[PDB]
Amino acid sequence: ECISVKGRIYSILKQIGSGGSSKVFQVLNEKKQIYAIKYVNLEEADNQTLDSYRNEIAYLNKLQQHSDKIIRLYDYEITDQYIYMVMECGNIDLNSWLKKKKSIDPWERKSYWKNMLEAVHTIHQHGIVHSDLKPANFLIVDGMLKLIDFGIANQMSQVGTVNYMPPEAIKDMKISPKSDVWSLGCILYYMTYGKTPFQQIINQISKLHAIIDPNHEIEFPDIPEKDLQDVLKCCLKRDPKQRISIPELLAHPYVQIQ
Numbered sequence: 001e002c003i004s005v006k007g008r009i010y011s012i013l014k015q016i017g018s019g020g021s022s023k024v025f026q027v028l029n030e031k032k033q034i035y036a037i038k039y040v041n042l043e044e045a046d047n048q049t050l051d052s053y054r055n056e057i058a059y060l061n062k063l064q065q066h067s068d069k070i071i072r073l074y075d076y077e078i079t080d081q082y083i084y085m086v087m088e089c090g091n092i093d094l095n096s097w098l099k100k101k102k103s104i105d106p107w108e109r110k111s112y113w114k115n116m117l118e119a120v121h122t123i124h125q126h127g128i129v130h131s132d133l134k135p136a137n138f139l140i141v142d143g144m145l146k147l148i149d150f151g152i153a154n155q156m157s158q159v160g161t162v163n164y165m166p167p168e169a170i171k172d173m174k175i176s177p178k179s180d181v182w183s184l185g186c187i188l189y190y191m192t193y194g195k196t197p198f199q200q201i202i203n204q205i206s207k208l209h210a211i212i213d214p215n216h217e218i219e220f221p222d223i224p225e226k227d228l229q230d231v232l233k234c235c236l237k238r239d240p241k242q243r244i245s246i247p248e249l250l251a252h253p254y255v256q257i258q
């Protein structure tokens with residue numbers, strides 16, 4: 001089984017990415033170099049959907065040259081019927097790795113955090129707020145985290161967590177770069193304490209109520225890394241104005257010292 005993209009033939013090893021109008025394949029070029037090919041079927045896509053797809057592709061292509069913490073787009077083919085994207089394969093996505101992980105090495109966690117800040121800072125610098133950050137949006141490649149997507153794509157049953165959702169998004173029923181800081185904060189909180197801040201709340205309506213409720217205090221059990229603890233408290237402030245920024249996070253002792 002094979003796919004051609006801009007003349008070049010790729011043999012398929014397996015399917016990574018599953019279901020929807022979109023599939024991801026692990027593939028090899030004729031020199032046996034490994035890649036991921038993202039395949040999108042465009043037959044049922046309206047113009048607004050199409051426009052979001054072209055817009056994410058254009059941004060991914062542009063911002064590549066600005067950080068190596070953003071996934072590599074090598075090439076693509078795009079017609080009225082389909083998109084093929086030839087991309088960096090990597091080793092494993094962050095969520096699948098975290099699921100099979102007993103505990104995280106403090107050094108690795110700090111390193112992943114640095115990568116995540118770098119990727120997200122980069123998109124913010126070009127006017128993009130992701131607004132839907134989770135572990136699955138990060139790919140581990142040679143012990144480096146890379147951002148897989150920018151959250152621009154429009155649309156593609158018991159999945160789609162609200163665990164990383166910021167309070168101002170829920171009260172808004174504005175989104176800003178601080179919204180990404182919250183979700184990053186929930187990812188780091190999960191890498192620190194083994195769960196996300198509101199993961200205990202069974203009912204989703206209740207969960208959303210806890211997220212926005214000032215009287216609902218998030219717990220920050222004492223840990224050896226006091227700087228890590230402070231990062232979490234700064235990221236998980238409900239008021240976006242008082243929430244720490246990415247530039248402030250990049251100067252934080254947690255990422256700078258030792």
Ligand SMILES: Clc1ccc2c(NCC3CC3)ncnc2c1
Nearest residue numbers: 016036087088089090091092093
């Ligand atoms: Cl676009 C893209 C590229 C690679 C992905 C990936 N790679 C890890 C799979 C073991 C090969 N895992 C999950 N999603 C991916 C998405």
